[PDB]
Chain A
Amino acid sequence: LQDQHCESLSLASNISGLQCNASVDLIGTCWPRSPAGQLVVRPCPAFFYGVRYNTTNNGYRECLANGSWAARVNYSECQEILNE
Chain B
Amino acid sequence: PPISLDLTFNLLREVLEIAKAEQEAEEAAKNRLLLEEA
**B31 with A26: CB separation less than 8 A:** no
Please give, as numbers and ranges, the residues of chain A lying within 8 Å of B17 by CB-CB distance: 84
Task: Decide yes or no whether B32 CB sits under 8 A from chain A.
Answer: yes
Taking chain A's interface residues, is the majority helix, strand, or loop, or is none over half, making it mixed?
loop
B-facing mask of A69-82, CB < 8 A → 1, else 0?
Answer: 00001011111101
B residues apposed to A, CB below 8 Å: 17, 20, 23-24, 27-28, 31-32, 34-38
- List 28 A–B pairs whose Cβ atoms lie within 8 Å, in order of A's numbering: A25-B38, A26-B34, A26-B37, A27-B34, A27-B38, A29-B38, A44-B35, A48-B31, A48-B35, A49-B31, A50-B27, A51-B28, A53-B31, A53-B35, A73-B38, A75-B35, A75-B36, A76-B35, A76-B36, A77-B35, A78-B35, A79-B32, A79-B35, A79-B36, A80-B24, A80-B28, A82-B24, A84-B20
